[PDB]
Amino acid sequence: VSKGEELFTGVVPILVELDGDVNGHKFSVSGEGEGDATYGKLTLKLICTTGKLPVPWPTLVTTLGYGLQCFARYPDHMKQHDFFKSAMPEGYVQERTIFFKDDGNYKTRAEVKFEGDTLVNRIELKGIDFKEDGNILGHKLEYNYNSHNVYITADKQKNGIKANFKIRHNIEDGGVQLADHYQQNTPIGDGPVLLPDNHYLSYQSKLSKDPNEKRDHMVLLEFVTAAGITTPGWLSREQVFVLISAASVNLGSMMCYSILGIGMIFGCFALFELLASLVFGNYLVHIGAKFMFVAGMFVSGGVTILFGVLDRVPDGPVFIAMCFLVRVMDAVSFAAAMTASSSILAKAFPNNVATVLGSLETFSGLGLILGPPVGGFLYQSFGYEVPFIVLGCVVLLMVPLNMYILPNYESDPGEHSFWKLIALPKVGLIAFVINSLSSCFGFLDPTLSLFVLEKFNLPAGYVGLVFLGMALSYAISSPLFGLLSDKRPPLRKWLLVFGNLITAGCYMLLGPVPILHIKSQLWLLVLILVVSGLSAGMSIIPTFPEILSCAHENGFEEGLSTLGLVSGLFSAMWSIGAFMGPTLGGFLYEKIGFEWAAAIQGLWALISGLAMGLFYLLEYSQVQLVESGGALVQPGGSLRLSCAASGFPVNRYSMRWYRQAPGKEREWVAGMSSAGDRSSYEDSVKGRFTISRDDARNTVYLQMNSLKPEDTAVYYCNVNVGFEYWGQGTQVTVS
Numbered sequence: 001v002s003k004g005e006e007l008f009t010g011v012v013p014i015l016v017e018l019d020g021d022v023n024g025h026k027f028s029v030s031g032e033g034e035g036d037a038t039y040g041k042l043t044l045k046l047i048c049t050t051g052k053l054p055v056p057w058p059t060l061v062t063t064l065g066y067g068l069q070c071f072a073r074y075p076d077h078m079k080q081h082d083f084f085k086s087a088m089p090e091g092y093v094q095e096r097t098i099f100f101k102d103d104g105n106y107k108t109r110a111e112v113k114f115e116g117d118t119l120v121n122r123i124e125l126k127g128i129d130f131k132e133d134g135n136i137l138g139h140k141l142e143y144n145y146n147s148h149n150v151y152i153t154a155d156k157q158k159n160g161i162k163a164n165f166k167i168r169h170n171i172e173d174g175g176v177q178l179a180d181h182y183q184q185n186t187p188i189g190d191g192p193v194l195l196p197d198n199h200y201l202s203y204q205s206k207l208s209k210d211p212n213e214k215r216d217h218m219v220l221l222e223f224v225t226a227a228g229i230t231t232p233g234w235l236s237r238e239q240v241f242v243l244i245s246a247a248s249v250n251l252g253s254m255m256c257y258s259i260l261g262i263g264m265i266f267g268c269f270a271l272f273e274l275l276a277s278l279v280f281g282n283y284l285v286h287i288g289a290k291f292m293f294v295a296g297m298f299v300s301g302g303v304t305i306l307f308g309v310l311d312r313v314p315d316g317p318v319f320i321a322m323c324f325l326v327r328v329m330d331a332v333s334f335a336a337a338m339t340a341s342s343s344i345l346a347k348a349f350p351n352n353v354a355t356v357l358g359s360l361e362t363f364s365g366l367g368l369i370l371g372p373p374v375g376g377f378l379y380q381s382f383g384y385e386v387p388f389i390v391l392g393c394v395v396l397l398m399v400p401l402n403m404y405i406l407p408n409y410e411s412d413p414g415e416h417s418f419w420k421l422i423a424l425p426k427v428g429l430i431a432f433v434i435n436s437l438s439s440c441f442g443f444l445d446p447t448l449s450l451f452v453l454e455k456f457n458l459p460a461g462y463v464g465l466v467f468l469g470m471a472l473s474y475a476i477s478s479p480l481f482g483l484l485s486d487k488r489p490p491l492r493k494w495l496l497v498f499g500n501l502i503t504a505g506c507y508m509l510l511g512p513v514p515i516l517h518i519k520s521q522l523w524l525l526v527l528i529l530v531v532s533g534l535s536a537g538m539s540i541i542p543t544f545p546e547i548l549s550c551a552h553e554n555g556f557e558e559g560l561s562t563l564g565l566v567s568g569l570f571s572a573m574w575s576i577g578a579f580m581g582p583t584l585g586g587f588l589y590e591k592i593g594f595e596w597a598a599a600i601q602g603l604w605a606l607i608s609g610l611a612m613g614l615f616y617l618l619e620y621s622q623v624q625l626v627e628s629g630g631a632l633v634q635p636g637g638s639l640r641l642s643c644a645a646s647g648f649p650v651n652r653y654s655m656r657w658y659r660q661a662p663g664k665e666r667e668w669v670a671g672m673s674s675a676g677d678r679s680s681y682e683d684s685v686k687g688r689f690t691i692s693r694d695d696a697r698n699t700v701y702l703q704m705n706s707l708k709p710e711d712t713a714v715y716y717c718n719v720n721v722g723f724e725y726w727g728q729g730t731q732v733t734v735s
Contacts, residue, residue: 002194004085008037008070011412013118014044016064020125023137025054029064037085039558040073042222047215056141057218058169061205062181065220067094067110067121072201072224077231081196083161087187089114099180103136104129113188135177142170142654143207146724150201159193160186170720174654174671174680199228206722241405242348243356246341247363248402249297252395253337254367256304259375259387265327270579272328274572276335281568282418285411285560289340294403296337301395303330308388335571342567343560346548347409351486353545358482365475368468414561421565426550429611430543433500434573435580436608437536440503440601442581451594456522466529473533478541485542492542493616499539500609506532507602511595544570623647623725625717630730638705641730643717644698651676651695656718657702666716670702684710707734
């Protein structure tokens with residue numbers, strides 16, 4: 001890792017210029033765009049100035065957009081195999097030979113270098129031996145480009161790298177055109193360059209037309225990732241430092257909450273907890289996540305030190321000015337700590353999101369089980385003021401160690417507001433889920449001790465024990481359901497919608513309803529409490545990656561600002577639930593007992609769960625393609641394969657059928673256009689294969705007869721609606 005990565009953290013403007021001729025016809029292209037190399041996202045607007053440009057727009061893309069190799073996202077183990085960022089304080093030179101099957105070739109020479117802040121790619125193009133009625137010069141290619149893999153090897157004699165890749169251009173009749181790209185990259189200066197090992201880059205592209213351009217134009221969007229080299233399988237110092245910091249803050253805050261665990265005060269706590277969470281999660285990058293984290297721990301230590309001074313303060317005008325201020329600073333410190341820790345922990349682990357928060361809640365359960373014992377151990381020994389000041393000493397002394405260990409993540413300020421994120425329906429229904437669960441919990445806290453002591457004559461140690469058992473069940477069930485949420489994202493939603501329903505079931509049999517006619521017994525109470533903790537811990541974990549993936553789907557820019565907004569919403573809905581729960585729960589208690597109030601809370605949970613079920617069975621549209629028809633037949637047989645696809649109209653889009661023999665690569669076999677009048681096949685499948693469509697069933701059929709034993713292969717189904725979606729594949733063996 002040289003200095004050249006330093007320029008590429010952030011958004012870079014891009015100027016691209018092309019001066020080319022194809023068979024004597026000349027064209028010139030100028031373009032401007034922006035690019036990000038931390039995530040690897042590229043956006044270019046390209047305009048032709050000469051006139052009607054002869055060659056199609058996709059076949060220029062790899063000349064124009066792929067030349068910005070230096071905005072690739074290299075993961076953490078790959079950074080010692082980076083060449084494009086290594087030789088770019090000064091630039092590089094890219095030569096490329098592009099062979100078209102049954103046609104001519106492109107020869108391109110490009111120079112990529114910084115001018116000031118901007119990045120300039122100056123490209124020269126030459127084309128040889130194109131048919132005037134062919135695929136390229138006949139404008140037969142489709143405005144559609146798909147995903148590919150670029151293979152890079154080193155070349156130590158020229159101090160540069162070589163690259164090979166192969167590209168399929170979709171043709172409107174149904175065919176594909178295979179372009180073989182051979183690429184040579186050479187640094188300009190004689191500085192220290194970083195020679196890499198063998199690795200491949202995945203390229204996902206999307207072409208668009210701007211709605212308000214009258215000249216020739218193209219909008220090119222690109223996602224680039226790097227892979228190929230195996231991993232040790234463990235964590236770098238960034239992730240381990242974030243884990244130690246999160247464990248320390250959770251253990252310290254649960255010590256502070258546990259060892260020391262009016263109406264206007266209780267209102268103002270949650271009231272302004274909501275407001276502080278909103279303002280602090282909205283303006284995350286303006287203050288700083290590191291500064292918010294250390295300031296939150298410092299202010300929480302100040303609260304737990306100055307908490308203990310209230311016994312020395314007489315009641316009067318000084319008492320209200322101290323207690324109001326301590327309550328307000330407790331609320332702001334909790335909001336800041338929770339928001340900053342969630343943002344940093346989500347940023348450090350981008351893929352393993354739910355698992356690490358589940359492990360953090362396990363550390364919270366450990367805090368809960370080891371708070372009151374050492375609290376009583378110090379209380380019986382020294383008194384009531386010494387444990388407070390020694391815990392304040394621990395929380396203050398963790399801060400100077402925390403300053404060096406936490407990393408700095410600096411990002412650009414956000415542009416989308418909070419009203420952009422809150423104005424979605426799935427966000428609102430998941431918010432109602434969180435609000436109902438937090439209200440369940442707020443009602444369940446104060447009433448249970450009175451109810452158990454009133455019906456079964458049992459002291460407060462037992463209700464403390466069942467609260468501890470509920471939170472211990474939540475601490476066990478949180479990491480497992482977080483792990484299952486991460487490994488299978490499509491089962492996230494049914495891990496949520498069912499779970500609240502199970503919670504509703506626990507609020508039916510918590511107090512045995514007189515409609516139900518079940519005899520009261522306290523083992524039923526403790527069993528329903530453990531099952532309720534399990535269902536609540538199962539529900540509370542998948543809400544964070546679901547809202548994060550929804551915001552990433554609906555155009556929120558990747559960075560700390562999106563995580564800050566999701567964390568702020570999460571804490572906001574927790575605060576609204578914890579405010580609305582105890583108030584109406586106590587009111588319905590003093591009206592009509594605990595027994596019907598538990599049923600009312602279960603009814604809110606039931607309504608929220610059925611709303612989730614109705615929404616998730618009335619919105620689902622994902623483009624997946626299922627394949628069927630694998631069998632075995634002696635040579636001479638016949639067979640019919642089926643590709644069933646949702647999420648798009650099949651009659652409006654083209655369809656293709658591909659074939660991978662074991663040991664060989666993928667080859668095109670069949671293609672069907674949109675109008676359904678034309679089809680195209682390969683030479684070895686011509687006349688003995690048919691492609692067909694039943695658009696009422698949304699199914700694409702391929703019939704084969706006279707099967708030679710050269711067709712033993714896995715068959716794939718190909719559609720592209722902006723990104724290509726590959727099928728599942730069927731194995732056909734002809735022995």
